[PDB]
Amino acid sequence: SHHHHHHGSDLGKKLLEAARAGQDDEVRILMANGADVNAVDEYGSTPLHLAALAGHLEIVEVLLKNGADVNAYDTRGLTPLHLAALYGHLEIVEVLLKYGADVNANDIDGYTPLHLAANLGHLEIVEVLLKHGADVNAQDKFGKTAFDISIDNGNEDLAEILQKL
Numbered sequence: 001s002h003h004h005h006h007h008g009s010d011l012g013k014k015l016l017e018a019a020r021a022g023q024d025d026e027v028r029i030l031m032a033n034g035a036d037v038n039a040v041d042e043y044g045s046t047p048l049h050l051a052a053l054a055g056h057l058e059i060v061e062v063l064l065k066n067g068a069d070v071n072a073y074d075t076r077g078l079t080p081l082h083l084a085a086l087y088g089h090l091e092i093v094e095v096l097l098k099y100g101a102d103v104n105a106n107d108i109d110g111y112t113p114l115h116l117a118a119n120l121g122h123l124e125i126v127e128v129l130l131k132h133g134a135d136v137n138a139q140d141k142f143g144k145t146a147f148d149i150s151i152d153n154g155n156e157d158l159a160e161i162l163q164k165l
Contacts, residue, residue, distance in 0.1 A: 002073045005040045012039030019059050020050035027059055037068045044074035052080040052096065055089045060096070070099045077107030085113040085129065088122045093129070103132045110140040118146040123158055130165050 015035040018026040027047075031037065038046050048068045051059035060080075064070060071079055081101040084092040093113075097103065106112050114134040117125040126146070130136070139145055144152075150159040 002069055002071050002079075003040075003044060004038050004046070004069075004072070005044065008041075009036075009039070011035050013041070015039060015047050016041055016045070016050055019047035019056070019063065020054050022051070022054060022056035022059055024058055024062075027062065031062075031066060037063055037066050038072065040074075043076075044072075046072045046074075046080075048072065048080045049074060049078070049083055052089065052092050053083040053087055055087060055092065057089075057091050057095065060092050064095070064099045070096060070101045071105065073105075077105075077109075079105045079107075079113075081105065081113045082107060082111070082116055085117040085122065085125050086120060088117075088120065088125065090122075090125055090128065093125055097128070097132050103129055104135045104138060106138065106140075110138075112138050112140075112146070114138065114146040115140055115144075115149065118149045118155075118158060118162070119153075121153075121155060121158060123161060126158060127161055127165055130162070136162060 015030045048063045081096045104112055114129050147162045
């Protein structure tokens with residue numbers, strides 16, 4: 001599946017750290033020495049998770065170009081698209097979608113990327129997720145949709161986007 005782990009070499013740990021820190025040269029060097037592009041830490045995060053979380057667009061692109069799993073799940077069920085939407089990185093959201101990210105993947109608690117972007121009020125990311133087929137009816141473990149979250153937070157601008165776009 002989209003879960004890896006099982007070994008955990010320090011070469012893979014170096015790639016995870018370099019990807020999260022946005023070191024383009026070191027990521028290039030480590031991959032040339034055979035670093036697994038899909039390595040995981042104790043939480044199940046891959047280098048693509050950490051580059052998307054920390055907002056490093058150029059690292060995200062070189063990882064995807066070398067066979068990084070765009071839909072990898074960590075132990076909480078979070079995909080790189082979840083993290084890009086949660087941390088508000090619009091261009092990374094777009095690149096992930098362009099590489100086949102599952103727009104409607106849900107984590108352990110049932111949150112989709114649309115849920116996270118709505119909770120944090122990232123209006124443009126919500127619009128982009130909707131254009132790529134985000135499910136407005138998807139409910140989390142509390143039975144709440146992305147639209148319900150915008151109504152409970154009184155974000156009428158976000159609620160209007162979730163209804164008409």
